[PDB]
Structures are given as C-alpha cells and as structure tokens.
Assembly symmetry: D2
Homo-oligomer: 308 residues x 4
C-alpha cells in the first residue's frame, strides 16, 4: 500500500450554487453520473451531498439519497462518503439522518464550530444568480457552521455504532486539537482519516505555510495513527493536492470544492479534476489507490456492509 494515493472526489456539495456553473451536478442522475465518471477516472472515494431538483438548493433528507447511493453502488465499488455537514446553516439533528440511516463506510465529521463566509462569491456571481435563495444564502454574514464538543461526541457515538468511520474535516489548528481530545478519550480509534481543509473564509488559508502547519500539527498529535488528506478550496485545489501527494498524503478534488479547471475556464466534469490529480500522482511515480486499497488504508468495513 506504499505509494498509493487515495483520490476523494466531492461531486457537488452545498457551498457552490447552480447559477455559478452549468456543470455543477443538481439532479440525482447528474450526481450519480458525476460520481460514476469520477470513480472510473480513479477516485476511490466519492463524497456525496444531494440537492432539490427544483431549485438546486441543498437537500439533506434521508429520501434525497435513495436515488443516489444504490445507483452508484450498482455501477462502482467506490467508497461512498456521506456528508454530515450538509449546508452549513443546518442543525445536527437534520444533518446526521442520512449517515445514520444508510450506515456508510465513511461519513464526514466537521470538527469545530466556525464562521462560514460565502459573501466573497457575491462580487463575482451576483449578476448571474437566477434564484433568490442563492442571493440570500451567499449574502448571509451570520452563517455559523455548528459543531460543538457535545455535537461531535453525539455524532461519533451514534454513527460509530453502525460501523461508520469518519473523514475528520479540520479547517484550522483548533480542529486537530479538538480531535485529539476525542482520540485521547477513546471515542474514535485509529487509523484516523484526517482531512485538512484550506482556503475557506472562516477557516485557515491556503498558503504553503498553512499546509505545513496543519501537517506538522497532525504529525505531532497523532504520530503514525492517521492518514492525511487535503482539500484546497477553489484555485488552490491542485497546488495543495500536489503538496500532499509529494508529502505522503492523500488528495480531494471535485466541483464541491472548486468550479475551475484553469484561469477563466470552468471544469466541465468531476472526472476532469480526478484526471488532473491522477496526472500529478503518476508523474510523481506514485499510483492512485483502488477502492479496495482505500478500504485497507482506512480500515473501512467494506462496500457490502452498508445499508444501501
């Protein structure tokens, strides 16, 4: 398993909105097409949100995932990673239900309460927004992404009972320290899949110093008992992916995180970003991990042990 790089592809998310790009997957069949194409391009893990087909807004209901999860599983042995973040305005009670019902191999777990600033995107996109909800959502200066110590404890206990393991989303140093508290108490066992998230307004930035700081903090707190993945938001996506691959870590791409393929060019598919990451990985002389290798690296329960 040495020299295997796990590519996670986050195909749609809840931060970008449909008016920002006609390539953002919205319908259930657009999301499954995107996931299947990304897995076939080399993504061992697919990170999934759902959306209302009517207006494209985030949909975190249990039923929203039924036409998504089984469809991808019939076509691909990729590891399906179900969000517990949903949209950052949502409550824990709403957010936990899909992963709780579907008992996936992986679920995201956001490790601290934070501001979430989407209003930067309002300068670029205000003129082309076709839905009022996009204007209100992106303009909201009071978004709080809630993940208290009690909330995280509750998600760890509830979802852990179903065999689900977590992608721990850490947006700044404090989230690694928060994770260390739960690790020391034994509420999660290794190996920890720790994803350091760079470049979001409200989180740490995407400077090389930020990347090395999160890596050296994770090394110190968890030593050998974790696997490192990175998420570089927006135009930082491939720079930070290349840093991680070169440093022994794993890589997240996807239109959830970055709508662009180059300067003034939108990415047309999730698979396209997977191919770019795979080109970097193979250029390093490394190899992209298969789903089976990702399951071994992350000690996952298996694609035949889920509730879909």
């Amino acid at each position: 398993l040495n020299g295997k790089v796990i590519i996670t592809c986050a195909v749609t998310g809840a931060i970008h909105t449909p008016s920002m790009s006609p390539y953002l997957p919205v319908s259930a069949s657009e999301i499954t097409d995107a996931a299947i194409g990304a897995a076939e391009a080399g993504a061992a893990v697919i990170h999934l949100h759902a959306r209302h087909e009517g207006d494209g807004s985030p949909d975190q209901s249990v039923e929203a995932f039924n036409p998504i999860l089984g469809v991808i599983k019939q076509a691909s042995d990729a590891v399906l990673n179900i969000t517990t973040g949903g949209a950052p305005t949502m409550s824990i009670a709403e957010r936990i239900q899909p992963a709780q019902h579907y008992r996936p191999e992986l679920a995201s777990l956001n490790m601290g309460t934070m501001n979430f600033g989407l209003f930067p995107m309002l300068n670029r996109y205000e003129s082309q927004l076709k839905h009022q909800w996009e204007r209100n959502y992106l303009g909201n200066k009071d978004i709080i992404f809630r993940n208290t110590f009690g909330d995280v404890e509750h998600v760890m206990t509830t979802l852990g009972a179903g065999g689900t393991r977590f992608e721990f989303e850490c947006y700044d140093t404090s989230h690694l320290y928060n994770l260390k508290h739960f690790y020391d108490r034994g509420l999660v066992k290794g190996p920890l899949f720790i994803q350091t998230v760079f470049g979001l307004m409200g989180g740490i930035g995407a400077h090389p110093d930020d990347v090395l700081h999160m890596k050296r903090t994770a090394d110190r707190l968890f030593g050998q008992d974790y696997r490192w993945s990175v998420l570089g938001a927006g135009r930082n996506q491939l720079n930070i992916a290349a840093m991680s691959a070169a440093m022994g870590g794993h890589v997240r791409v996807g239109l959830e995180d970055n709508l662009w393929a180059g300067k003034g060019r939108l990415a047309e598919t999730n698979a396209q970003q997977v191919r770019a990451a795979r080109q970097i990985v193979e250029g390093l002389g490394l190899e992209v991990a298969t789903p089976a290798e990702a399951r071994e690296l992350l000690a996952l329960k298996g694609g035949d042990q889920v509730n879909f």
Copy 2:
C-alpha cells in the same frame, strides 16, 4: 519606543470561577484593588470584566462597571481595556453595552465564532465547586462563543464611533484571516493590536510551533502595521510571554488567564504575575512600557477622553 514591552493584565475574566481560587477578584473593590496593584507593578493596560457580587458569576451589565472604571482611573493612568467578550455564552447585544456606553480607549474584539470547552476544568475542580451555576457552566459541552462576520462588523462600526480601538483576540489562524478581511475593507485602521491566544480548548494550542505559526501569519498578512501581543493560557503564561518578548512582541498576564504561580501554588495577586513578566522583560535588557508609551504604540485616544 524601541525595546518597550507592553504588559496587559487581565485581572478576573469570566472563564475561571470563584470556587477555583479565593484570590480570583469578585467584588468591585477586589477588582479595582487588583487593577491598581497590577498597574503599579508595571502593567500599562488593564483588561476588565465584572462579576455579580453575590455568587461571583459574570456580570456584563453597564451598571456592573460603574464602581470599577472611575475608581481605577482616579488612582492610575493605566489604559483600561473593557471586554466585549463577557462570558462566552452571552449574545453580542449583551456583550457590547459596557464599551458602547463608557467609550473606553481599548476594548477586546473576538474575531471568530468558536467552541469554548471548560469541561476539562471540571476534572480538577468539580469536588470543590460551591455554586450550582459553576457546575452548569463548566459542564456545558455546547458553548458557542459567537462572533460572526456580521457581528464583528457591527461591533467595529458601533464602538469605533466612540473613538474606541480594539485588542483583536485571535484564537487560531482563521481569526487572523478574518481580521485581514476587515482590514482590507477599511473597517479598522492600523496599527492593529493583535492578541494571539494560545492553549484554550476550542482554540489553537500552546506549542512553540503554534506561537510561530500565528506570528508568521500576522507578519505576512499585516506587515509593519500591527503590534503583537500573546496570551498563554494557564501553565503556558510565562513561557509564551517570554517567547513574545524575545521576538519583539508584547505580553498579557493575569488571573483571568492563569490561576497558578507554580506547580501546586495559586497566584495570590495579579501584580505578582506582572512582576514575573517584568523580570523576564528586564532580564532581556528591555523595559516595561508605561501607559503613555502604550497609548503611543497603539494610537489610543487618551485616558481622559473616555466616558468615566
């Protein structure tokens, strides 16, 4: 102004509770004695909270500061820094009122929403808590210390109109990036008094790498247009103060931040921690800044241009 180190003394705060130490100042006269003693020991800035005299709980009313501010000002020319943090469970609308009414030279300004974990303190102190409010407060696993982007913009505009400048409390990298957003928009003007806070549960830790990361980030984001202060929580108080003093920064001590004088000994006065910091500063060949020197370094309006 070269080689002057500003010592801020935070005399009581809202995180420690009275059952933890008989030396924690509770009454107005205890708080004013503490402030005057700290300033005479060499603290140029006194950072102030108030408490209910009955049960010692945090009191962020305008009236609670009335027997405090004028008494200190009559005895000392120290810069009085009024909290806008209050207790981390409080709303912005409650927290803003003292600084809004009294128009101080300096007020704290917390730069991001974050978890605040006090339940660790339950390990050492649970057996000696005298008040039920202390059990409920310390045991609360769902504390959200709220400071959204809209919140912070509101405090900046409202208090800046009274001539108040801020001590920007930055508990992790994202808070420096948050501050950069407002600085770039012109909502606060330099020199920025940036206090990097280490070792709180919910914030960055107190490792030397954590200190350098915050310093390097502030240097890159703000260049020469800021003044750096550190707060090392608990047992980290003097180590981190010494790092800052040796690196051209400023220092915060006080029983708000650390109840201890050494292993197994409570600090009896705020002044005693000021004296320890002053011993480090003078050992380095530096000098402790006077209040007038702090006002020049921080571009403050003056101790007699306040509403008390």
Copy 3:
C-alpha cells in the same frame, strides 16, 4: 507579466560528477552521450541544461576546458536551451581547476556554490560498492574527508571573474547558511537581481529532503530576498520528483536529471534524462502550469542571450 505567469523552468542536469558509471549504464559519459542527453532533454521540455564533462576512458569527472569543447557547440547547434556550465566540478576539486571552463566559454549561466561543506558520498556504498568496476570509484565514494571548498574569498573571486564575462549565476544553496552567505554578497552589490537561487536537498553534508527543510529554505529566501529572486529546487535521489512538485505548486522552478537521481520510478532506473523531464512536465501540466521555453527562461533570469557566449 502575462507571457510569464505560470511558466515553470525545468533545468536538466544530465550527468554531473557524483554518480559514477558503474551505478547505471544510462549515466552519460562520452561527449556524444552527454550531447545526446542534453538535446533530448531540451526537446522534452528542459529550458536549461546543466553540464559537466567526463573522461571518456574511465568515466571520471573531467573539468578541463578541452573536455567541454566537443559538448557546448554541438548542443547549441541543435537546441536553443540555456547552457549552464558547472563551476562545482567534482567536490574534491580546487577553485583554480573548477573556474576555467566558465571563464573561457563565458556562458549565459554558471553554477556558483555558496559555502564550504563536507560532501559525503559514502551513503552510496551500501547499494553500489560491490558493483564498482573502477578503483577510482571505490576511492572516491569511500573518501570520508571531502571538503567542497567555497570560501567567502573564493565566491567573491568567482563572482568578479565570471561576472566580467556577462555570465549570471545559479546560486547553489545546500543549507540556510548559504542563503545568508548570498545575502552578504547581494548587500555588497557583487551580484544583481533577479537572483537565480537553487536550494539543494538531500545531500550528505547538506540539508535533508524533509518537507520542513524545503519550507525553511523557501521562507528564508523569501525573507532575505523578497521579490528579487527566482527559486529552483533539486531533490537528491528518490526525493527528486516530490521536491519538484512542491516547488511547482509553490511558484518555484525545478531541476531533474541523472546528475541527481538515477531512477525513473519504483524498481526502474531512468534510461534517459528526457524521461525525467517528461515526468516533471507531467506534474507541471497536471497543475495547470506550462513549461518555460528557453526564451522565457532568459527573460525570467535576465540572461545575456545564446548569441553572446564564447562557443
């Protein structure tokens, strides 16, 4: 500006002086093997070729002026790549021997090593000692007392002597002190910006190849030189592509070549220098960046031009 944003210079160091012929049949030795290696690497995308020469009989380092005569003109006739002539030679050599090729040929670019250091080749004994066919290889790799001499007076001498010929330098910095040494000379005005600073990772006697080492060298160069430098990196051995990727992702330039790394991948020796250039180019293009042309490298590095050399 626009024409140079996102352009990554690939330097290819085709043979060097550290690896020895017994270590790989693909190490270029003869003048024509070296020119073939340089031309193929340039055609694969290397804008700069970094050059040493070797004795054709035993493959040992040859830093005579004559050794470069069948090399430089041949490559220039076939490629417009910038030719970077070593002033390092082998680390056992004196300044008086090392300076003569660049002094004579007046290249656009010459390496300039920025500090005296131990140079340990004995890490190569474990893998290679038994297969060494030449006694000179055994004596060289086993030498525990190699001093790679680059005193303050030496570096000043080389700066003055080669600078008079219009040659600009690739400043080879093997640890923090070499950046500080360069800052001393920059402050005295003995070299002018933009400084082409190459930070070298993983050599025994130099800094290692840990990611922290890379960031430390980058941060130090940023603080000392601000905007007035161009950053390149070199990772020894299996660190070569990892460190090239870090630099490309951070706004720097990259060096590959069999002078630095004999491998193409896991369990696979590199058959050509071009192969390593293609791997670096795949990383650069995967990032959405582009490989710089020789003309772009000349502009980025403020070089005198391929028509202004003595060959």
Copy 4:
C-alpha cells in the same frame, strides 16, 4: 522529576573569535580566565566552556600546557563542569585541536559537527581602527577561513576522546550539522543523551531569526526525539533573546564573552558573571531554576568532576 524545570547555563568565558583589542574585558591571561570561570560559576553557570590564549599577544593557544594553569585552578575553587574546546581557533588542524581534551580527559568537550566557512571580517567595520596586533588584523581579515570538521575528522575525535570517558557538546551551526550528527548516532559512535547545541548568528552558519531557532529545534526533535538535551548559543546581540526562547521551550542556554562582548546599548560587558546573572534572571522569571553542576552532570550523563585528569 526533580530535574524538571532546571536550566543549565553554560558560560563560555573567552573563546577564540573575539580578540583582545575588541574589549579590555575579554579574558586573556590564565588568571583572568580562571577568575572569569569562577565568577561565572558562582553567579550560577553549571558548565564553563574553556579556551586558552597566549599571554604575550592574546592569540588563541590550544597547547596542552596552555590549560595547565587553568583547569586545576578552577576545579579547586568550583565544582562546575569544565567543557574543553576541540574547536580552538577555526584555522587550526584537528591534530592541534584534539590534544588538550585527549590529555586532560574532561567530562565534556565541544565537538563541531561540520566543515564551514567562518567569516570574521564583518567585525573589521566596528573594530579595525583599534586593533593593536598584526595577528588580529590578518585573522579577522582572512576571507578564506575553513573551520575543518570532515566526516573522517569527527569520527576520529569521537573514537579518541570517547575512550577517555569524555562526552560531547555537539556544536551544530546549521541544519546539515544535525543531519551529520544523525549519521553518527545511527552508527552507534555516540550514545544518548546527546547534548546538542545549536549555534545562531555566525557568518558562515545559520542566522538568529526566530524562524531559524524553531527550524533547528524541530529538526533536532524529529531526528533525535527524546534522546537529547538542547542548548542554544545566540551570537552577539541575540544572546539573551535566544537564551529566553530556549528556556521557555525546555532547552538550556549558553552565555559568555566568547559569544557576545556587549551588555546593552553601547555598553561593553564587564564580566562573564554579568551575563550569567541576566540569563538567571530570565530563567527565574519563568519560574524555572538554574541547574547546579551535579544536576547538569545527571542531565548530561557525565562521568563526574573527580574522574578527570586534572
């Protein structure tokens, strides 16, 4: 646990880099050096780092005989650990440099971990006009000083001096010296706990920026883990800033006129003890305590002050 919070102060009383014309307070004669050492120990320095000088012209003297009126005198007056240089002056050969530590078998000797340039000529801008001695001008003006410490040299010193029970203070002037030490440590030529001194601010070595300090510390942490004790040396005006960083980070500190001639703004340091007192004030201001010689011997695993050949 009883050694928790103890900070070793080493005092380097004269060295070989500063020269007599730079300061009348730089110790030169044997009795000036012993007075300086005893005063520094009494101020709280648990280790004294020693060089000797020719009494006639003040130039570095690394002969065995030069230490004869020094080592026994200090030992009679103080139980401080005596650390004998094997660096001498940076122009000297290994064979000259090794002889005092080989003969006297000290508890501690310096061990410089890599070959490097040594730039003294910046000191000419400040001090050129007051230089009395021809040797001072030609030494400080020499742009070609190579402080030689090859891999072969270091191996030879480790083997020879280790046979006398001497343990080393590994002087690391840049990252590569830590990596060089890691090579010998992995080969078993030195055993822990390694006493690793990171030297900041010399021309030819790493600078004295806070980034340099944390970089050297995080490198030593990664390469040696728990099996080392950290000391710092900040050259010149960085002396107390870098000492304070180390004390606040769990390390130990070196002061002395070997490293810094100054006390403050335009004020020469009058004694070594004065710099020990400043370091001690920082240590005690942190709530830590200065280590005694016995505590330094335990922290550094030294053979004892009665196990030396003087």
